[PDB]
Write an enzyme that holds these catalytic residues in place. Structure first.
Site, PDB file in Angstrom:
ATOM      1  CB  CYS A 147      -0.994   0.053   1.291  1.00  0.00           C
ATOM      2  SG  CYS A 147      -0.134  -0.469   2.857  1.00  0.00           S
ATOM      3  CG  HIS A 167      -1.212   4.085   4.239  1.00  0.00           C
ATOM      4  ND1 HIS A 167      -1.769   3.911   5.637  1.00  0.00           N
ATOM      5  CD2 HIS A 167      -0.823   3.139   3.789  1.00  0.00           C
ATOM      6  CE1 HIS A 167      -1.763   2.448   5.633  1.00  0.00           C
ATOM      7  NE2 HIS A 167      -1.104   2.079   4.719  1.00  0.00           N
ATOM      8  CG  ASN A 219      -4.782   1.966   4.291  1.00  0.00           C
ATOM      9  OD1 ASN A 219      -5.766   3.133   4.583  1.00  0.00           O
ATOM     10  ND2 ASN A 219      -4.935   1.023   4.761  1.00  0.00           N
TER      11      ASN A 219
END
Ligand SMILES: NC(=O)c1ccc[n+]([C@@H]2O[C@H](COP(=O)([O-])OP(=O)(O)OC[C@H]3O[C@@H](n4cnc5c(N)ncnc54)[C@H](OP(=O)(O)O)[C@@H]3O)[C@@H](O)[C@H]2O)c1
Ligand SMILES: NC(=O)c1ccc[n+]([C@@H]2O[C@H](COP(=O)([O-])OP(=O)(O)OC[C@H]3O[C@@H](n4cnc5c(N)ncnc54)[C@H](OP(=O)(O)O)[C@@H]3O)[C@@H](O)[C@H]2O)c1
Ligand SMILES: O=C(O)c1ccc([N+](=O)[O-])cc1P(=O)(O)O
Ligand SMILES: O=C(O)c1ccc([N+](=O)[O-])cc1P(=O)(O)O
Ligand code: NA
Ligand code: NA
Ligand code: NA
Lengths: 357, 347
Positions: B127, B251, B324
């Protein structure tokens, strides 16, 4: 003993200033608590004594030997020069005087000698800068520093009591009321003095303080400029990204350095361990590294994840954590006051070097 | 159309795989949901139709055209070779096959061409790596990349459904019951597969995955190795610090690069804006920058805080944010499967 004033006694930093003074080695004969006229007339504790809060004014500093300012840059700009004029030695937590060439910018483990030349005001660096200087000075001493790249993970208590309460409120709204984070109303973060406000709950805000004209924020530029002054070396390249995360207390930093000489990695660990105020917390075999939740309440600065860069021969990465209201603010300031006392530097200044506003 | 199997349909990534498939341009004749023996027999929706979850076995892959695996490395290690044997094209979300020299490691906007060389398995990258590759490829194309240094701010959903629930429970204990964060009980984070577990509430954990022998974690080393493979250049120096923070999804990454040639900042901004899958959000005069809370639910990768290093002539800092579970996982995988379809590679 001394008469000591705490300016901003009712705030987030102010509360810790009180605690750090209660636990200090300073001989304190009299304590005064100063804040705004809103708090003046109310009462706060020093140990078991009730202390009447006073308004901060040009005339509030008569008889005071040492004043610790943690009431925002504007309050320091306005009143610290009057305190100096009254004969006070001021330790200022704010950004206002930090880059004034007549003002020592001090972390006592790093550059206590700079205290000798004070003109009545000693500045405490920004919280993020202090913990980084504690971690890196033992490295600079032995192998030098060529450059620093830092990414911070900063707690909200640095933005004051209101920011703490706004963070708590937002998190409760999401977790208890089922409010979506993007639907939250914010009034303070990322910066009380900026135009737009954003939620911090379940977010990472890459803005601390306001933007400067070079597209770095004031917080990032504080780290750059204060490092060069504290370490007395304008040749150290420093670039920072400062990010607020949902933590109430204790800042964390991912720190990259390049030294001047190759520094053996296990010796770097040893030098940091050996440096007063820095604690080596680094045993990856047992998942030991500094953590914000463990650092809260301690005056020490914790360093781990120390490891070489995969490619740059002189590159080293590490993780640095400290309580932002303690070593980051109140403890650094009280340590400065203790150092002044211990080195015979608590005395009225001869000549006024600061503009009265 | 195709018969599509989702292995790990019941997990955090699997739920998004379902969503991405429901919204996909893939012609799906038949959908199958596979998980462990303990989820088997339960029911889950694909659009309006109820689908029975089946136990993943050596023989369960008969009739399947495409299998998307998001059930952890051990499941992929075990069952993906059997699916390939049965003639299935496997798109694998796990780390297990990523460094296999016979397995393409693909971000479609960056290296779709590598799909042509597949031998039945295609790996989706980590990710954190994916969003970084989307941001940096348009720069690499014009001015090259000499090195990358990255510090991540990773959401808990990357550690699975359990981690999300653990994070929420911990935060409520602190805020509602007054428990000190250092007193919280934890069972999953930082890593389900490591010995000791620590609270994430009001914390930042500088560990994702387990440690390797060089004192970087596997997460950090994935970013290093996967970057080199995806960009097909071993000379790009990459070092990472991967940190978990109290964000549920999306993220964020503080990314430093040095280019091979000086890249003017306004041109860098325009190159990223021009790059499909990257969205420029960068107007500091109006406090515009990517934020995790705004990125959730979008397939785009958002890039801002773009600025020159204060000293390094060729250095550039930026801030990169993406959901993510989407571009970081389920959307990258579904986009791989659509690319396979569009290029006639579902063989
Ligand atoms: N309005 C709200 O909704 C709200 C939200 C949270 C907290 N508060 C309260 O209001 C105060 C300010 O909040 P905060 O988040 O700014 O606290 P803070 O940032 O943690 O601390 C600010 C400190 O600076 C002091 N100060 C402010 N103006 C001053 C002046 N003109 N001269 C001297 N000192 C001055 C404050 O005194 P004072 O305490 O006298 O202002 C306080 O001691 C706090 O003490 C808190 O109890 C209000
Ligand atoms: N129905 C029940 O009573 C029950 C009981 C225990 C666990 N579970 C499931 O277990 C998961 C535990 O949470 P998590 O944080 O680990 O989830 P996660 O990381 O978000 O997702 C893991 C995924 O991998 C699958 N998986 C694990 N081992 C497998 C195997 N040997 N073969 C095939 N697939 C496998 C899981 O299916 P599974 O859902 O079958 O594990 C799940 O779909 C939950 O998502 C829950 O659905 C269900
Ligand atoms: O910005 C800072 O560094 C800072 C830090 C601490 C305190 N304070 O009052 O304790 C104030 C400031 P600032 O210069 O007011 O923003
Ligand atoms: O670590 C990873 O990169 C990763 C990412 C996604 C998934 N998954 O099942 O969707 C699994 C892994 P991992 O290799 O199992 O740890
Ligand atoms: Na030490
Ligand atoms: Na002395
Ligand atoms: Na290179």
């Amino acid at each position: 003993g001394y008469t000591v004033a705490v300016v901003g006694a009712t705030g987030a930093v102010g509360a810790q200033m009180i605690k750090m003074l209660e636990e200090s080695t300073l001989p304190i004969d009299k304590i005064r608590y100063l804040a705004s006229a809103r708090s003046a007339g109310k009462s706060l504790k020093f140990k078991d004594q009730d202390i009447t809060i006073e308004e901060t004014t040009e005339t509030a500093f008569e008889g005071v030997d040492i004043a610790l300012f943690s009431a925002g840059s504007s309050t320091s700009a306005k009143y610290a020069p009057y305190a100096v004029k009254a004969g006070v030695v001021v330790v200022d937590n704010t950004s206002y005087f930090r880059q004034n060439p007549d003002v020592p910018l001090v972390v006592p483990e790093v550059n206590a000698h700079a205290l000798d030349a004070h003109n009545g005001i000693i500045a405490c660096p920004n919280c993020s800068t202090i913990q980084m200087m504690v971690a890196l000075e033992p490295v600079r001493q032995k192998w030098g520093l060529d450059r620093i790249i830092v990414s911070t993970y900063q707690a909200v208590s640095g933005a004051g009591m209101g920011a703490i309460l706004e963070t708590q409120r937002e998190l409760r709204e999401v977790l208890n009321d089922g409010v979506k984070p993007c639907d939250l109303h914010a009034e303070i973060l990322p910066s009380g003095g900026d135009k737009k406000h954003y939620p911090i709950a379940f977010n990472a805000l890459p803005q601390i303080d306001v933007f400067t004209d070079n597209d770095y924020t004031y917080e990032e530029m504080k780290m750059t400029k204060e490092t060069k002054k504290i370490m007395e070396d304008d040749s150290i390249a420093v670039s920072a990204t400062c990010v607020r995360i949902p933590v109430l207390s204790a800042h964390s930093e991912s720190v990259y350095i390049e030294t001047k000489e190759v520094a053996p990695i296990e010796e770097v660990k040893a030098a940091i361990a050996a440096f007063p105020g820095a604690v080596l917390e680094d045993d990856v075999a047992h998942q030991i590294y500094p953590q914000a939740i463990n650092a809260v309440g301690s005056r020490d600065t914790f360093v781990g994840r120390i490891r070489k860069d995969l490619d740059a021969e002189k590159g080293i990465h590490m993780w640095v954590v400290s309580d932002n209201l303690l070593k980051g603010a109140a403890w650094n300031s009280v340590q400065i006051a203790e150092t002044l006392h211990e080195r015979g530097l608590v005395r009225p200044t001869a000549e006024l070097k600061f503009e009265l506003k």
